[PDB]
Structure formats: C-alpha cells, structure tokens
Amino acid sequence: VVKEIPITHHVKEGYEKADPAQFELLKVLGQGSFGKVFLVRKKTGPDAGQLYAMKVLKKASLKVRDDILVEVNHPFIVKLHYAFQTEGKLYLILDFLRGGDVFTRLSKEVLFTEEDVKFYLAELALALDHLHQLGIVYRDLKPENILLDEIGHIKLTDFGLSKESVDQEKKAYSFCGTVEYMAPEVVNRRGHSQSADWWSYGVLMFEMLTGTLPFQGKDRNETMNMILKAKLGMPQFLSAEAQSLLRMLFKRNPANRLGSEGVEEIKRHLFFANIDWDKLYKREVQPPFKP
Ligand SMILES: Nc1ncnc2c1ncn2[C@@H]1O[C@H](COP(=O)(O)OP(=O)(O)NP(=O)(O)O)[C@@H](O)[C@H]1O
Ligand SMILES: Nc1ncnc2c1ncn2[C@@H]1O[C@H](COP(=O)(O)OP(=O)(O)NP(=O)(O)O)[C@@H](O)[C@H]1O
Ligand SMILES: [Zn+2]
C-alpha cells in the first residue's frame, strides 16, 4: 500500500536536536517551485561552522510502498542532516553541493562525448533504482535537481518528497511536477510509477545528448499532446548503443518500457558496457569534469 509518512523530525545519528537559531544565514543558493534554497552555517554544536543547505517549507511527507530517512542515503543523493518544525514551518537541513548543476557545467564545455554524459547518467541510474528498491518514486525529475559535489560526482537535491510551499500565493496555484519530462501515463493522470522516472530519465539523456528537448510546445497542453502523440526523429549523430537505449526508454506505455522490471536490464545495456558498477557506486570512477 502506498503509505504517506509525514516528515516532522530528524536528527542525524550522533548529534543534538536543532532549531533555526542554531543556523546563520549566508546566501541564497537558488530558487525553485517549492521555494528558495539558502546557504546556512551551523553556529553551535559539534558541526559548528560547517556549511549546510536549508529548505523552508510548510510541510513535507514521503510516499513509500510496503528510519526511512536513514535508508534513503546514497552516494549520489543529498544527505538529510537536520529537520524541525517552528511556527508552522518545516526546516530541512541538507548537504551543500559546491559544484552547481550539471547542465551549467556542460555549457562550460565547447564539446563533450557520449562517455561524459554516460558517467552522469550511470550514477543517476544508481540513485533512481536505489529509491525504487525502497518503494519510492522521484515524481519530479529535472536538471535543476541534478547537481554536482565539489569533485564532480552526481548529487540529487531531493528523494521523492511530497513537499508544500509556504508562499500561499504560488502554492495555491502549484501543479505537480515538470511537464517536459512527464511520462505519457502521468500526462493521462493515470498516476506516477517507477517507469515514469525512467521516461524522465530518457528525456534527460535526450536533452543532454542533443541539447534540445524531445517534446516542447507553445504551452502545457501542446507539450502534453506532443508527449502523447507527436513524432520524434532519432538523431543520426548518436552511437548505435545510445540510439538503442533511447529507443527502449521512450515507450509511451510502461511495462513495455525499459527498467519497468528492474534496473538490471538498464545496467546490462550495451550503452553501459564499459561501466564497472560497483566502483561507480563506490565513487571510484573518475568524473569527466571538475566543477
Ligand atoms: N544542497 C544544495 N546545495 C547547494 N545548492 C543547492 C542545494 N539544493 C538546492 N540548491 C540550489 O538551489 C536551487 C533550487 O534548488 P531546489 O532543490 O530545486 O529547490 P526546490 O525546493 O527543490 N524547488 P524545485 O527545483 O522546483 O523542486 C538550485 O538552483 C540549486 O543551485
Ligand atoms: N510511491 C508510489 N507508488 C506508486 N504510485 C504512487 C506513489 N506515489 C504516488 N503515486 C501515485 O501518484 C499519484 C500522486 O499524485 P496526486 O497526489 O494524485 O496529485 P499530484 O499533484 O500529481 N501528486 P504530487 O506530484 O506529489 O503533488 C497517486 O494517484 C498515486 O497513484
Ligand atoms: Zn504528481
């Protein structure tokens, strides 16, 4: 059963309960549809002076199939250090990623290879499948959530949290996730699934390898009509393996799509042939670009 577990409290193993006064505000790290992410410094405690990223929400819950904030930890997913509730607000204290997002780093290159993208896509695959094994769907996957650490290893900004903004204005008009990366069944309000994450994954791959989105229109309904019905030519400058992976990921019907049964059929793909997956998971594979 899809179970909603509300996030009200969390203190990392071996540390003390936190409160907003223990955090000094330094800068705005950015702004997303669930609000701004700020940069804060721990003023007191064993980790005093250390930098963290702070998200401020009204509330956040986690939908899991069949402690969990400890299980979601992954080499390529941000770590939840603190979490607390004051004045109807939920503060989340996470890792501060110093590399910025990936697309920004790619645009700092005149050119890149299929291998460079393959690295990031691989680590991303590990993260996604790890979330799926816990029974978690990432719901809203988009480049803005894919950042780099100081070294260049992938780090996601979230782990499938169902969040709620504090801005009453915007949140009253808030509408789910990002349409460009929506799966055809998600567009059809059939509900999110594991396979939709892999559709979005395929859209990310396409966007990285082409620099363009496969489906985008003048508005939401046109983009959706495109995702559902429009034609999509295969970029002939891609390797056979890449074309294969894209062809297998882009399936409008899930359970006909790659990864609907396991990521093992994604790990074995000829596109990921020279990828040592355990060394990848151990962050022992040298990243293509330093942030
Ligand atoms: N842990 C982090 N460390 C450093 N910068 C971060 C971190 N998390 C987010 N950012 C920055 O903050 C901006 C928005 O982050 P994000 O995590 O997407 O906010 P959000 O609440 O998830 N809104 P949304 O992007 O719509 O889901 C991005 O431009 C990032 O550069
Ligand atoms: N862990 C999960 N496993 C399976 N299905 C899920 C899971 N989490 C959510 N869903 C499905 O996705 C839907 C959740 O979206 P819903 O709450 O109806 O509106 P929504 O705005 O699209 N959700 P959200 O993106 O979190 O704001 C439900 O209809 C579920 O069937
Ligand atoms: Zn949704």
Sign of the torsion formed by the C-alpha atoms of 277, 282, 285 and 288: positive
Cβ neighbors of 123 (< 8 A, separation 6 or more) are 75, 76, 153, 154, 280
Q: For residues 57-95, b (16+ Cβ closer than 10 Å) or e, as one string? A: bbbbebbbeeeebeebebbbbbbbbbbbeeeeebbbbbb
The preferred substitution site among 182, 192, 193, 198 for testing ligand 2, maximizing ligand atoms within 8 Å of CB, is: 192
CB–CB of 163/57 below 8 Å? yes
Experimental technique behind these coordinates: X-ray
Residue type for 188, please?
N
3 state SS of 222: helix
- List the residue whose alpha carbon is closest to atom 9 of ligand 1: 37
C-alpha–C-alpha distance, residues 17 and 84, integer Å: 8
C-alpha–C-alpha distance, residues 190 and 48, integer Å: 47
- List the residue whose alpha carbon is closest to atom 20 of ligand 1: 32
DSSP 53-94: EEEEESEEEEEEE--HHHHT-BTTB--EEEEEEETTEEEEEE
Nearest to 81 by CA among 119, 107, 54: 54
137 lines ligand 2 (CB under 6 A): yes
- C-alpha 176 to ligand 3 mean position (Å): 4
Which ligand 2 atom is nearest residue 137's CA? 1
Domain residues for the domain of 161 are 100-283
Q: In what order do the strands lie in the sheet with 89-94?
A: 10-11, 80-86, 89-94, 51-57, 35-42, 23-32
Any idea what DSSP says for residue 130?
H
C-alpha–C-alpha distance, residues 1 and 224, integer Å: 29
The preferred substitution site among 63, 175, 220 for testing ligand 2, maximizing ligand atoms within 8 Å of CB, is: 63
38 lines ligand 1 (CB under 6 A): no
Token couple for 204: 């990310």
Q: Which residues are catalytic?
A: 140
Q: What is the dihedral of CA 55, 33, 77, 83, to 10 degrees?
A: 20
CB–CB of 39/50 below 8 Å? no
CATH of the domain at 209: 1.10.510.10
